[PDB]
Amino acid sequence: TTEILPVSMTKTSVDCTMYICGDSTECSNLLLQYGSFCTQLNRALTGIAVEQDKNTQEVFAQVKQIYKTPPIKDFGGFNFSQILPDPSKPSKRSFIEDLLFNKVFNGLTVLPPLLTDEMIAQYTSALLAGTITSGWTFGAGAALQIPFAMQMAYRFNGIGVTQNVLYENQKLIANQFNSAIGKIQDSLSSTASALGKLQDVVNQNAQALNTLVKQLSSNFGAISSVLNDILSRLDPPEAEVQIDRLITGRLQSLQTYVTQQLIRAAEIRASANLAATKMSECVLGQSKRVDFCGKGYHLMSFPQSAPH
Amino acid sequence: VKQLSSNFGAISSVLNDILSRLDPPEAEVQIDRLITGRLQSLQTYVTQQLIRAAEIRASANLAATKMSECVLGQSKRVDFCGKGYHLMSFPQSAPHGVVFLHVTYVPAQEKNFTTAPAICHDGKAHFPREGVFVSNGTHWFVTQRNFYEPQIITTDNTFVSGNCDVVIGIVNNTVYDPLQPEL
Amino acid sequence: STQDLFLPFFSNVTWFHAITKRFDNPVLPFNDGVYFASTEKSNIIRGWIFGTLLIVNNATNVVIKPFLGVYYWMESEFREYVSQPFNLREFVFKNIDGYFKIYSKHTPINLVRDLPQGFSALEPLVDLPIGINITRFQTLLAAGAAAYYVGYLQPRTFLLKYNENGTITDAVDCALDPLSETKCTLKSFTVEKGIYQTSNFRVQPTESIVRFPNITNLCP
Amino acid sequence: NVFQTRAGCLIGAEHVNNSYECDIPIGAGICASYQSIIAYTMSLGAENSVAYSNNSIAIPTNFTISV
């Protein structure tokens, strides 16, 4: 089955002085009177941005050592080509990450993510090759080899069935598993409103940036929305009333972006906390927690990366 | 506290000065600018505290789940309580938080041995009841999975379900019967 | 963190030496303020004359209405507030809002080097409400061992550390090294490992191109 | 020593072709540390490969209790 969980959101910063004023000494002098409002906001957006790189680290960086899959793949009748890294493409992206990724100004800067999408995919390949080659053992203490046809049979004796069932029906279980991973590429390709959960986080952030940039084109009650014109065509004593209307208005638009981002950063932190728990209790072990990890009894789970 | 020293556009940041040195109709214009700004400043503190209180309620709720499942019982959830297999955890208070000392058993000194899915004796496939069949080069033994305690394969530690044909990997070895020597 | 006219740390202070015969009573313009570390063992350097109106601060008295030929001492040199009749001396003179403010500290330890390296803050000495303008100044002296160093004060932001008895004991100029700017942002004299944002770099414009059309027929 | 990175331009640090754990995080896979200040691509972790074979298991033979 498949669970798409958001872990991180774009890290963006707004320089308040450039947004509220804009290359104008006259506006900057009025703005300093208001106080530390301008330096309180820049710290909030820095807090959302650092936490957006602890969210990615906790979900993926649970493996201290990078494990590597054996050169000849003889996992007992099981084929994991559609989950294991394929060297022809980005070389870190398997047949399903590439499918997943493809399916997905002024005072404003977007800071770059610390773990590039390749390093996020060398972590997923460690977790996958450690699990196919070791089992629950990699994430507990030292990593110990077990033949895959026998890692399952210990995962089928945790759902209550006995070992004889896997060894007697190993060819059927292998063909049932290989065929089912294959449909997951059709399901996440031909028909995915599944990637919607990750996409709404991209869309909702962009509609909020678009609203901030548009508010720079609203008078708020001054003669004009352009700082140069108010200052150029008015005497210096009476322009200050008109700039103060823009500064109170433009500052209110930035406070609404920062509060709404602090509220939406918190929802992504809860999704990053469930994704870290699902990596440790489902990829790194077998869960008896009903429906935490799939509808059915749980045998194994496999991490795959996504745009965010 | 340091935003009570900002004009917010008024003549002065101190209420007594505005009231004393300006006429009462004019002062209300200057006083209002302070009231609007010093109220936006309180509204921002309260709103950030309301968002920060929720981060603490989530840590307070995870700490209560760790006390019940980790202090008052053993947990099979992986990495909820320490890296390793959980044995017990002890609760210790801190200024405004709790520190939990999580005891865990981390396995060590691994050794590699050859193993088989089942062992065939008398045309029947004997599978390990609880354990792994392992070989020290020449002899086959049943050992527990998480520690090496080699033991002789007997009817007591093995169950029979089938014939040598279905399992791929069956090795052939002798499974002892405790009764035959006594009989 | 205080914003005021302070002498930038690690600056070039013009050094005038009275040694041969070398006479230094010239045109030093008081652009904003003037630090003045006169160091004189024989007390030859005794006064300063300020002008646009002269706020003379002679050895005898401050009178608000060219050298002193003082010898072993004639004092009739000229080209009304009045005041009480009267090593390194580090006077700082500023003229803000019409008050001439002078701050000074005499350091008992003598200077083996031309200027010692230490933080000695200057305690306010006097403020006079002259209500006048000063544009240039000149020293007044009795050559002997005479060394007066004049460095003009500039607008700057400094973080000053106050001890427990109120004495400034350290300061960090916050426009010098990148580390000094970072210390002001964190409001601490000791930083810790990390990447800390300090400011914003904006490429400033160069010219002002104004382009209208070719234009057609003028007025008849 | 000017170096151009995806997260900006870093002046004052020398690129080292080696790789190590991240100390101060500059961004886009580049970190920096006192060697001088050296800018290096981050190393995700050691690289180890479990033997893996159709017929080989490894069984722990001792334990460690760890608080």
A22, A227 in Cβ contact below 8 A? yes
| Of D36, A34, A263, residue with least CA distance to B55 | A263
Q: Is C137 part of any domain?
A: yes
d(CA C60, CA C51): 18
Cα separation, A123 vs A92, whole angstroms: 10
User: Does an H or E element contain B55, and which?
Assistant: helix B24-66
Place of tokens 């720079």: A216
Whether C219 maps to a domain, the answer reads no
Neighbour-count burial of A67, counting CB atoms closer than 10 A to its CB (0-12 exposed, 13-18 middle, 19+ buried): buried
**Residue B62 CA: distances (Å) to CA of A285, B19, B82, D14:** 21, 53, 14, 44
**CB within 8 A of A229, min separation 6: which ones?**
A223
Residue C88 domain flag: yes
Q: Which residues, 6 or more positions from B1, have their beta carbon under 8 angstroms from its beta carbon? A: none
| CB-CB neighbors (< 8 A) of A69 in chain D | 49, 52
Count how many domains chain C has: 1
Q: Is B172 helix (H, G, I), strand (E, B) or coil?
A: strand
Q: Is residue C209 domain-resident?
A: no
Q: Are B114 and B134 in contact (CB under 8 A)?
A: yes
CB pairs under 8 A between A and C: 6
Name residue, tokens 């002062």.
B27
User: Could you tell me if residue C218 is inside a domain?
Assistant: no
Q: What would the 3-class secondary structure string for D1-24 be?
A: CCEEECCEEECCCEEEEEEECCCE
Return d(Cα B127, Cα A106) in angstroms, integer. Answer: 70
C8 located within any domain: yes
Q: Which residues of D touch B102 (CB under 8 A)?
A: 67
Contact B112, D57 (CB under 8 A): yes
Q: What angle do CA A106, A108, A113 make, to 5 degrees?
A: 145
DSSP A107: S
**Which technique was the structure solved with, according to the deposited record?**
cryo-EM
| Closest of C143, C138, C150 to residue C23, by C-alpha | C143
Q: Does C200 touch chain A (CB under 8 A)?
A: yes
Give C108: exposed, middle or buried? Use CB within 10 Å, 0-12, 13-18, 19+.
exposed
**Interface mutation target, options C200, C204, C206, C210, chain A, most CBs of A under 10 Å:** C200
Per-window interface: C 70-129 vs A, CB < 8 A: none
Please judge whether D58 and B143 are an interchain contact, meaning their C-beta atoms are less than 8 angstroms apart: no
> Does C66 fall in a domain?
yes
H/E element, B120? strand B119-121
Other C-beta atoms lying within 10 Å of the C-beta of residue B151: 12
Residue C216 lies in a domain: no
3 state SS for chain C: CEEEEECCCCCCCEEEEECCCCCCCCCEECCCEEEEEEECCCCCEEEEEEECCEEEECCCCEEECCCCCCCCCCCCCCCCCCCCCCCEEEEEEEEECCEEEEECCEECCCCCCCCCCCCCCCCEEEEECCCCCCCEEEEEECCCCEEEEEEECEEEEEEEEECCCCCEEEEEECCCCHHHHHHHHHCCCCCCCCCCCCCCCCCCCCCCCCCCCCCCCCCC
- What radius of gyration, in Å, describes the C-alpha atoms of chain D? 19
In sequence order, what are the beta bridge partners of D57?
B113
Strand partners, B141: B134
Q: How far is CA C113 from CA A229, C9, C87, C97, C100, in A?
A: 57, 18, 11, 37, 31
Going A89 to A92 to A98 to A102, the CA torsion angle's sign is negative
User: By C-alpha distance, which of B104, B85, B90, B109 is closest to D66?
Assistant: B104
Q: Which residues contact D16 (CB under 8 A, 6 or more apart)?
A: D35, D38, D39, D40
Instruction: Determine the distance from the C-alpha atom of residue C132 to the mean position of all C-alpha atoms in its chain, rounded to a whole number.
Output: 18
Nearest residue to B157 via CA among B116, B114, B126:
B126
- Exposure pattern of B110-133 as b/e (b: 16+ CB <10 Å)? beebbbbbbbbbeeebbbbeebbb
**B110: β partners:** none
The CATH number covering residue C122 comes to 2.60.120.960
**Resolution to 1 decimal, in Å?**
3.3
Domain range for residue C39? 1-202
- Crossing angle of helices B24-66 and A37-51, in 10° steps, is 20
Contact C141, C25 (CB under 8 A): yes
Q: Tell me the C-alpha distance between B8 and A31, whole Å.
A: 9
State the CB neighbour count (10 A cutoff) for residue B105: 19
Residues A285/A305, Cβ–Cβ less than 8 Å: no
Which residues, at least 6 apart from B45, have a Cβ–Cβ distance to it below 8 Å?
none
Distance CA A156, CA A299 (A): 7
CB proximity list for A177: less than 8 A, separation 6 or greater: A78
Q: Which two tokens stand for residue B103?
A: 């005891």
Alpha carbon distance D31, A184 (integer Å): 37
Read off φ and ψ for residue B75, nearest 5 degrees: -115, 135
Within a 10 A sphere around the Cβ of C142, how many other Cβ atoms? 22
Closest residue, chain A, to C200 (C-alpha): A15
